[PDB]
């Protein structure tokens, strides 16, 4: 019933033109696409079939290698599998290359006809028409057959990829444990993600490995047959283009490295900025972080400027290579005494363009892709050859075999380690007896769990595992999918047993709270689940399996204790009355009701024992370029672009003019050929050389200027955004995840620094080239303007009618790439249960289904891309037809030069248009980074850091803070946390504030700190908080928070980032915190490097450095926010003593809920309804004659 692939019933014509894809677009144009408008993968392309056939090939290869005692080669298997299906595409590649080379010959023939133009000779006209028809027939063959063949090549690559992914998943299912000892799940996921991806690219260019050279050779021959030895010179510089380009890349690569580290450091520091944004804000350390990040950004910007200059030079050289080659070869041609003509020059130009495109783009990319594919295949081969677990012997006919006995088996997980890790495995569990092994984390519990051939193949001893085994992992796991699949695990829909097990597990309430029930799919990354639910579903799966050996492992620990007891009573006593029920227990009641007890000692046990014993508008472009540079520079840049394109075209135009003038000179010299007037080679050669030099210079200048202005725009935008976010209020950080901001600062800026300038420059270059070709065609033949207007218009519509669909399918592809990997990870996470249930084929089928869906997405993406390419290339071919045939129509008003030039540029148009449209789409969809960047640059700010009031230095003279009608309001439009606060705090008063749990306390401290908006009256030392700049209040305000976060870098910055305190004071402070000896032994000393967030430093040391910073602040009044809430008692008491004596002169405010912190405080503010009607002291009510103090006194002492 699933919609079959329409390609199955499509004829040859529809397949060539991708006509059958039309309905999908008609759907896509109307509504957003989904996975139900999909197309099923062809039956021969399903993951299972490719996996099976490649497994057969690989096994045959391995057997052959073992026969002759050789190392098996994965590449040999791949070749032996796919050479038959690839040689046909190679043959077609030969055909396409032959057509591409042969087209310029007919171009020369038609130009020759134009050269010998006799209007009366109709036979010449007919021959010219035939040559034009052959030329356009070859052009059409290229135009459409190339796209069909490209789709088939990409499909072959996708087939290789899907087969390799199936291979990897199957091996991972059979993969061993010394693999986990050596490799990690991350490595396997990386193999499945990146290493296999290369196979989807190499096959694109693989045939060029033989097509590239051969074609070039043929081209060379052709060129000789037209211009002789001169051609060699041109080829020479083309060959010179190969190593130097590579050389550039090497330097580029080096520069890339020197950027990345800086960038990494940059982002790392900024992570510490975003993660501890509140800490930085209340510490007034924004300036130091800003300076550090600015230095890092400046170094990175210098490096990327160098890299972009090199890249622009390379791009301009690639763009001007054709002009360089043509100029060199025809200069050598001219000084060799030969005379130029339009036919020969334009034949040489076209051949040189084609062979240069091939050699400089397809061949190097082909070589690089082949090398990458070889590397990935080597890695996959190493993974496959990795040893797997010995195949567990198939369960022999259980002739009353439900008895397990291990006779003092001794083996270790790491047999290399001769230490007796696991030994004395001597036990016997009979049918119906449950061995509730007990012991406090006695090393060896996993072995008892792994007693059913986990990793304990009997080296010396006996193992009698017989029957079906149900196993529960230490961490219960569920794969992505519906619950029904987990419960069944391939068993039949036994509805009676299903309802019995679902009611036995007491999952009815879970289903009721669940929005859909047993049909519910696993939530996003398993978020909508809990450990208790996972344990319950694992138990339900095991009980529904109805195996013989029920091997459990702490299933009832995860679920609540009482519910665990209900499940034990309902299941173990009744359901598991007659089962093999070995279970490791941590609760006494479980082994109290056990049938067999076992006290386990490390290694050998002591004894058995008994229990008793998104479309970006023009505004984005305008803002981006305005941030770029002044509009005068923009005008200069567009003028430079126009000049570069004009010179590029006028070089060939001057060649044509030379040819035409020489033709007229030859006509004149034919009558009376005795003077033999020679055209002045000095004048023409000098003009030609000047034109090509101007082309090179303008191309280089334009590339460099575009790169410079775009990188400057990126730098300015980054600086503006950083300044904006550093001035953003905390509410913005609360309303946005840290990961989101880090992603915006990392990926978008990386785009704007690496890809956006390159892509924009390439798009501008190729668009200018296309406009140049169109303008040449129009200028040579004005009438071509008449049919050009509809054509382009059609294109525009086509673009829309494609883009509105393409994005959708692109999205689909992404949304189907993620699940596959996850399944593998899940298959790796719960692999133990998979081997326990002998259900490897089920997970294999699940993986095949997932990856078949992904193959549907890939097939749709490939097909829609090819459809758009076919239509637009048909537009190009129609344009070429128009140019050539209109030229033949108006042959009475044209010369050789202009027709040659126009036809050559029309021939060039195709690939240029392809690249221009693709680059335009890339730029458009990739400017969303710029749009988000701009949105970030225009977020709401707060009060300026520095005001103009400038309160006098040492402003907290007495620290008399007065509150008057403080109605704090947290978030605009949100709830009002605090109202009418009139606290009257005097100088040198230790107030142990308390109330409203922790939310009200946090609101109060934020309001006091001006961190939020303090709606109320605050006289901090008789000065309003409003009339003080933010930073000015921030500095002289000491606070020790609950979280002592540390920043990577040097110690000295951590104690003093602004570096205004002499080292002796730092040593005195370190002595006060009793850490002088701790830093003295550190090799880095004051310049000590710190691990990620001070990992090596302990939490006690973190609070120590925090209170050392507080000491260095020397602020008269201090805030303490739950310093010793969950810290070790030794650190608790040392910190308490530090506050007691080292802060005996400061008006501290202890904002914490801890009893010890508040008892010492002389004053505690009592608030009821915000109005203190009873003007008294707490001491008259501290003797439990109130409500709250009664609670603390009774409960907590
Ligand atoms: C990539 C490089 C581009 C430049 C270059 O190498 C390859 O291109 C080659 C062409 C060679 C010349 C070809 C023919 C003649 C024959 C004779 O003069 C004509 C006599 C006349 C009688 O009727 C014809 O037979 C004298 C020698 C001369 C001029 C050659 C000299 C070397 C030249 C210039 C070579 C030069 C170094
Ligand atoms: C990538 C590389 C860039 C450099 C380069 O190759 C390709 O560019 C080529 C240009 C060649 C010269 C062109 C013309 C002639 C004249 C000829 O005789 C003329 C005599 C007299 C009456 O005929 C003239 O009025 C002798 C040979 C000479 C000087 C060539 C030498 C090789 C040169 C320098 C080649 C050089 C190695
Ligand atoms: C900043 C921008 C730089 C480019 C540009 O704008 C400004 O500068 C302009 C100069 C123009 C050229 C001036 C002279 C001629 C010669 C003539 O050829 C007749 C041959 C024969 C016929 O009988 C004579 O007897 C016509 C063509 C050509 C090359 C012009 C082409 C267009 C050009 C390149 C314009 C171009 C748009
Ligand atoms: C943008 C770039 C700069 C301009 C340019 O390239 C593009 O545009 C081209 C226009 C060309 C000229 C057009 C017409 C004539 C015909 C005839 O006029 C003899 C007059 C003389 C004797 O009677 C009077 O004393 C001789 C040739 C001449 C002047 C051309 C020369 C080359 C020129 C200047 C080219 C020049 C390099
Ligand atoms: C942007 C870059 C600036 C430098 C540059 O590239 C572009 O600018 C180009 C201009 C070229 C000259 C143009 C005209 C002539 C006159 C000719 O003789 C005339 C004789 C008689 C007419 O028949 C006089 O009435 C001899 C050659 C010469 C001087 C050219 C030499 C090369 C030059 C200098 C080129 C140079 C490499
Ligand atoms: C945005 C882009 C800026 C650059 C650019 O595109 C747009 O601006 C265009 C101006 C074009 C020239 C205009 C006129 C002519 C004369 C004509 O020759 C005789 C014609 C007729 C006489 O009877 C029939 O033969 C053909 C050649 C030439 C020089 C054009 C060359 C291409 C040029 C340089 C184009 C160039 C690529
Ligand atoms: C980017 C844009 C692409 C299009 C375009 O701009 C740039 O490219 C320019 C080239 C121009 C042509 C150059 C030479 C001539 C020869 C002249 O000879 C008159 C002889 C006699 C009989 O008419 C007079 O009575 C007639 C006019 C013509 C064909 C021009 C037409 C306009 C054209 C097509 C321009 C057009 C607007
Ligand atoms: C070279 C090839 C020629 C044929 C073709 O590919 C390229 O050209 C494409 C253009 C597409 C149409 C664009 C817009 C509309 C919108 C809406 O109707 C609006 C009607 C209204 C417009 O002014 C008044 O008429 C319904 C869909 C429709 C007609 C598209 C249908 C598919 C078409 C015909 C495509 C077709 C396969
Ligand atoms: N992968 C392994 N590599 C080496 N030794 C292993 C491995 N797995 C198990 N062992 C051996 O078995 C012990 C496993 O520790 P153990 O405390 O039994 O884990 P557990 O069964 O997960 N216990 P718990 O999670 O506390 O209920 C090790 O200390 C080794 O003696
Ligand atoms: C002359 C060749 C131009 C090719 C470069 C692409 C030009 C695109 C012109 C249309 C701009 C976008 C119009 C709306 C469609 C969209 O949202 O992409
Ligand atoms: Mg254990």
């Amino acid at each position: 019933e699933v919609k079959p692939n329409p390609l199955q019933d499509a004829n040859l014509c529809s397949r060539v033109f991708f006509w059958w894809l039309n309905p999908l677009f008609k759907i896509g144009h109307k509504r957003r696409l989904e996975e139900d408008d999909m197309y099923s993968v062809l039956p021969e392309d399903r993951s299972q079939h490719l996996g099976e056939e490649l497994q057969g090939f690989w096994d045959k290869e391995v057997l052959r290698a073992e026969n002759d005692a050789q190392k098996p080669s994965l590449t040999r298997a791949i070749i032996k599998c796919y050479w038959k299906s690839y040689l046909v595409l190679g043959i077609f590649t030969l055909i396409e290359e032959s057509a591409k080379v042969i087209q310029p010959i007919f171009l020369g023939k038609i130009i020759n006809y134009f050269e010998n133009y006799d209007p009366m000779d109709s036979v010449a006209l007919n021959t010219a028409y035939a040559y034009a028809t052959v030329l356009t027939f070859c052009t059409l063959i290229l135009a459409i057959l190339h796209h069909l063949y490209f789709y088939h090549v990409q499909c072959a690559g996708m087939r290789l990829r899907v087969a390799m992914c199936h291979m990897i998943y199957r091996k991972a299912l059979r993969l061993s444990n010394m693999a986990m000892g050596k490799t990690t799940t991350g490595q396997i996921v990386n193999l499945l993600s990146n290493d296999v991806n290369k196979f989807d690219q190499v096959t694109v260019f693989l045939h060029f490995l033989w097509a590239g050279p051969l074609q070039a050779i043929a081209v060379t021959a052709l060129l000789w047959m037209e211009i002789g030895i001169s051609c060699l010179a041109g080829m020479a510089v083309l060959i010179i283009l190969l190593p130097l380009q590579s050389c550039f890349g090497k330097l580029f690569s080096s520069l890339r490295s020197k950027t990345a580290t800086f960038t990494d450091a940059r982002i790392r520091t900024m992570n510490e900025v975003i993660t501890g944004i509140r800490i930085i804000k209340m510490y007034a350390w924004e300036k130091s972080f800003s300076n550090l990040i600015t230095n890092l950004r400046k170094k990175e910007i210098s490096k990327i400027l160098r890299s972009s200059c090199l890249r622009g030079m390379n791009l301009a050289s690639f763009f001007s290579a054709s002009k360089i080659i043509v100029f060199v070869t025809f200069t050598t041609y001219v000084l060799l005494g030969s005379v130029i003509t339009a036919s020969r020059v334009f034949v040489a130009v076209t051949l040189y363009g084609a062979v240069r495109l091939t050699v400089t783009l397809f061949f190097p990319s082909a070589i690089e892709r082949v090398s990458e594919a070889i590397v990935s295949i080597r890695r996959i081969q190493t993974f496959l050859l990795l040893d797997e677990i010995s195949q567990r012997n198939r369960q022999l006919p259980s002739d009353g075999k439900k008895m397990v006995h291990v006779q003092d088996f001794t083996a270790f997980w790491d047999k290399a380690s001769e230490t007796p890790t696991l030994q004395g495995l001597s036990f016997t569990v009979r049918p119906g007896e449950l061995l509730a092994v007990v012991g406090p984390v006695g090393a060896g519990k996993s072995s008892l769990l792994s007693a059913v051939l986990g990793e304990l193949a009997p080296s010396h001893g006996l193992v009698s595992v017989h029957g079906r085994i149900a196993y529960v992992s230490q961490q219960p796991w569920v794969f992505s999918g519906t619950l029904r699949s987990n419960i069944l695990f391939g068993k039949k829909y036994e509805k009676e047993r299903y309802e019995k097990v679902i009611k036995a597990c007491a999952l009815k309430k879970d289903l009721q709270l669940l929005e859909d029930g047993d049909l519910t799919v696993i939530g996003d990354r398993g978020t909508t689940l809990s450990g208790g639910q996972k344990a319950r579903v694992n138990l339900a799966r095991a009980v529904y399996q109805d195996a013989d050996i029920y091997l459990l492992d702490d299933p009832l620990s995860a679920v609540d204790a009482e519910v665990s007891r209900h499940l034990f009573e309902l299941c173990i006593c009744q359901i598991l009355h007659e089962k093999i029920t070995i279970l490791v227990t941590h609760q006494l009641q479980y082994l109290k009701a056990a049938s067999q007890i076992l006290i386990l000692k490390d290694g050998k046990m002591v004894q058995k024992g008994t229990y008793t014993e998104g479309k970006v508008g023009f505004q984005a472009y305008k803002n981006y370029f305005r941030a770029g540079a002044h509009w005068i520079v923009f005008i200069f840049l567009i003028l430079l672009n126009t000049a570069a394109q004009v010179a590029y075209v006028l070089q060939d135009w001057w060649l044509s003019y030379w040819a035409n003038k020489q033709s007229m000179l030859n006509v004149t010299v034919n009558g009376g050929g005795n003077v033999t007037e020679k055209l002045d080679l000095n004048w023409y050669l000098g003009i030609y050389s000047g034109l090509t030099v101007a082309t090179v210079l303008f191309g280089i200048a334009r590339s460099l200027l575009v790169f410079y202005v775009l990188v400057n725009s990126s730098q300015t935008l980054h600086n503006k955004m950083f300044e904006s976010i550093l001035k953003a209020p905390v509410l913005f950080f609360d309303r946005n995840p840290i990961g989101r901001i880090l992603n915006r600062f990392s990926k978008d800026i990386g785009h704007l620094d690496d890809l956006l300038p390159l892509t924009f420059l390439d798009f501008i270059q190729t668009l200018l080239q296309v406009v140049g070709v169109v303008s040449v065609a129009v200028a040579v033949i004005p009438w071509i303007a008449i049919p050009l207007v509809p054509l382009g218009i059609i294109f525009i519509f086509l673009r829309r009618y494609f883009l509105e669909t393409s994005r959708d399918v692109k999205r689909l592809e992404s949304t189907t790439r993620s699940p596959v990997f996850s399944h593998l990870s899940s298959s790796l996470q719960g692999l133990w249960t998979i081997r326990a249930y002998k259900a490897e084929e089920r997970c294999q089928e699940l993986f095949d289904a997932h990856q078949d869906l992904h193959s549907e997405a890939w097939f749709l993406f490939l097909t829609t891309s090819r459809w758009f390419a076919v239509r637009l290339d048909a537009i190009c071919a129609m344009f070429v037809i128009i140019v050539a045939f209109g030229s033949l129509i108006l042959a009475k008003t044209l010369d050789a030069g202009q027709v040659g030039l126009a036809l050559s540029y029309a021939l060039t148009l195709m690939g240029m248009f392809q690249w221009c449209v693709r680059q335009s789409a890339e730029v458009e969809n990739m400017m969303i980074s710029v749009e988000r960047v701009i949105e970030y640059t225009d977020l709401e700010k707060e009060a300026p850091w520095e005001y103009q009031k400038r309160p006098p230095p040492a402003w907290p003279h007495e620290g008399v803070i007065i509150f008057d009608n403080v109605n704090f309001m947290y978030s605009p439009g949100g709830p009002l946390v605090l109202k009418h606060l009139t606290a009257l705090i005097k100088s040198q008063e230790k107030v142990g504030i308390v109330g409203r749990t922790g939310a009200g306390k946090s609101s109060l401290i934020s309001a006091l700190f001006r961190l939020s908006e303090p709606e109320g009256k605050i006289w901090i030392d008789k000065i309003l908080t409003t009339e003080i700049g933010l930073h000015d209040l921030r500095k002289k305000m000491s606070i020790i928070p609950q979280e002592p976060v540390l920043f990577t870098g040097t110690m000295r910055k951590n104690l003093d980032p602004f570096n205004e305190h002499t080292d002796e004071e730092l040593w005195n402070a370190l002595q006060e915190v009793q850490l002088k000896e701790t830093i003295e032994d550190l090799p880095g000393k004051m310049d000590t490097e710190l691990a990620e967030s001070g990992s090596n430093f302990s939490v006690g040391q973190r609070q120590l450095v925090c209170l050392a910073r507080a000491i260095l602040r020397k602020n008269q009044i201090l805030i303490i926010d739950e310093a010793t809430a969950n810290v070790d008692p030794r650190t608790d008491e040392l910190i308490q003593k530090k506050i007691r004596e080292k802060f005996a002169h400061c008006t501290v405010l202890t904002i914490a809920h801890r009893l010890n912190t508040i008892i010492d405080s002389d004053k505690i503010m009592v608030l009821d309804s915000g109005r203190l009607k009873e003007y008294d002291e707490p001491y008259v009510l501290l003797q439990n004659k109130e409500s709250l103090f009664y609670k603390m006194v009774q409960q907590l002492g």
Side-chain angles (χ1 to χ4, degrees), residues 229-230 232-233 236 332 336:
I229 174 67
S230 208
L232 259 280
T332 278
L336 255 287

Side-chain angles (χ1 to χ4, degrees), residues 392 452 465-471 545 547-551 836-837:
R392 151 71 213 272
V452 307
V465 176
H466 311 309
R468 296 171 36 240
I469 318 103
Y471 162 76
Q545 171 68 286
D548 310 350
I549 308 85
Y550 271 71
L551 209 170
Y837 287 140

Side-chain angles (χ1 to χ4, degrees), residues 644-659:
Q645 187 55 44
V646 153
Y648 181 83
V649 156
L650 285 201
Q651 203 246 21
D652 298 344
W653 179 89
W654 175 252
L655 262 177
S656 86
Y657 173 88
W658 191 345

